[PDB]
Amino acid sequence: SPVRFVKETNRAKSPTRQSPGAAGYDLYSAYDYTIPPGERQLIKTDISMSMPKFCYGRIAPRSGLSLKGIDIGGGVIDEDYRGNIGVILINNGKCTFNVNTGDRIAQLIYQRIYYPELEEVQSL
Amino acid sequence: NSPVRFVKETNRAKSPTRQSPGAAGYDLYSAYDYTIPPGERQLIKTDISMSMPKFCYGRIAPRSGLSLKGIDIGGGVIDEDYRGNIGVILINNGKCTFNVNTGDRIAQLIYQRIYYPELEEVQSL
Amino acid sequence: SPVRFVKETNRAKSPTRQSPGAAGYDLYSAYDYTIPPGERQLIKTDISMSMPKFCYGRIAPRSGLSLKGIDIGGGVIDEDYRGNIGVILINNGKCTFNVNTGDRIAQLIYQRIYYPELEEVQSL
Ligand SMILES: O=c1ccn([C@H]2C[C@H](O)[C@@H](COP(=O)(O)O)O2)c(=O)[nH]1
Numbered sequence: 060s061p062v063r064f065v066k067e068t069n070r071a072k073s074p075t076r077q078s079p080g081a082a083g084y085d086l087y088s089a090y091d092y093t094i095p096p097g098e099r100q101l102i103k104t105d106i107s108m109s110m111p112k113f114c115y116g117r118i119a120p121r122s123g124l125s126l127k128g129i130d131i132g133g134g135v136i137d138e139d140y141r142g143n144i145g146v147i148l149i150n151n152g153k154c155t156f157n158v159n160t161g162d163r164i165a166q167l168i169y170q171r172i173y174y175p176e177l178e179e180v181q182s183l
Numbered sequence: 184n185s186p187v188r189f190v191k192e193t194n195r196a197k198s199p200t201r202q203s204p205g206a207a208g209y210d211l212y213s214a215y216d217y218t219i220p221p222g223e224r225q226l227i228k229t230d231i232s233m234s235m236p237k238f239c240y241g242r243i244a245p246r247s248g249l250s251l252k253g254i255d256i257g258g259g260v261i262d263e264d265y266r267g268n269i270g271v272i273l274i275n276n277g278k279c280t281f282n283v284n285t286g287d288r289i290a291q292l293i294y295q296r297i298y299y300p301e302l303e304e305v306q307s308l
Numbered sequence: 309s310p311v312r313f314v315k316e317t318n319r320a321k322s323p324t325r326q327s328p329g330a331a332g333y334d335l336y337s338a339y340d341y342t343i344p345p346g347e348r349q350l351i352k353t354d355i356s357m358s359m360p361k362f363c364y365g366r367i368a369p370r371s372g373l374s375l376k377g378i379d380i381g382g383g384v385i386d387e388d389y390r391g392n393i394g395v396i397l398i399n400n401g402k403c404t405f406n407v408n409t410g411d412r413i414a415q416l417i418y419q420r421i422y423y424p425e426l427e428e429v430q431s432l
Pocket residue numbers: 118132133134135136137139140143144145146147245246247248
């Protein structure tokens with residue numbers, strides 16, 4: 060079944076997929092931000108979605124931004140989350156990093172996971 | 184399908200918990216008291232060992248509350264065959280000292296499904 | 309079917325798993341590098357791969373290097389990537405970090421993923 064998503068405002072851009080072999084789906088900033096060196100900023104996408112079962116969405120770095128010193132903080136979108144997906148951009152570069160509305164900021168990867176029951180034992 | 188067995192190596196260990204039925208993984212807690220200066224990192228002991236599930240690894244993943252305070256996760260690959268005590272590398276990239284108290288939630292362990300292909304060298308792909 | 313790989317030069321080393329229960333395949337530097345503190349470097353492995361289906365390769369940290377302050381930037385090797393696999397090593401230690409040709413620098417994890425359809429809705 061398809062993954063449903065909602066645009067909170069008209070400023071949101073629907074996540075995009077360019078090729079059959081891409082790991083993920085492009086995420087875009089819904090707002091203008093400026094991030095000083097050595098600081099981080101939560102970037103709102105204005106996109107909420109119903110994640111697939113036995114999966115989480117990993118907010119993953121674009122390589123081009125990573126080479127510029129821009130890293131991703133947090134980034135775990137659980138299947139229970141119905142809120143605004145936020146990208147924590149960390150400016151580990153030396154200059155101010157500017158984020159404009161519509162800028163590609165990360166890629167969302169639907170990562171397959173397991174939910175085992177945990178059982179405490181005396182020894183393994 | 185079958186349960187993942189785990190051991191509390193001391194009485195200070197807290198059983199990893201599911202936050203909600205659709206949470207990504209299992210919350211880990213500090214078994215000891217630490218102070219992490221700004222621009223430093225610390226291996227935080229959980230005193231938890233597990234018999235990890237097959238064809239997965241445990242990713243030590245950040246909780247966003249800590250990430251927004253500048254606390255990031257180093258390392259974080261828990262191999263399927265690892266039988267030792269699980270450690271969480273907390274990196275204080277914030278401006279102030281970060282305090283970790285015994286029992287504090289520090290990360291979420293995600294059982295990520297993986298593939299072990301055979302690798303074969305070729306002249307051309 | 310096995311993952312086919314090519315050595316771009318004879319400086320490349322074949323990725324291997326340490327043990328039958330290891331999450332990742334060892335990646336090695338094909339060249340010498342020097343990384344200043346608070347900087348990063350794209351490290352060439354000189355290995356290219358025909359990546360497996362419904363997977364991406366995550367460039368993941370080795371714990372020893374992580375404890376020394378060396379972190380991984382970027383790290384998403386898409387299914388469709390047929391180029392030289394690069395490792396972005398970030399030196400978050402306090403001293404200059406030396407990379408010698410042949411050094412183990414990271415691990416590649418073949419992470420299982422989904423490529424779902426996306427559908428915009430009014431409400432989740
Ligand atoms: O980088 C992130 C990390 C998390 N979340 C969402 C998903 C979670 O359900 C919620 C709370 O995150 P935690 O504090 O529980 O990690 O925020 C984001 O939007 N961006």
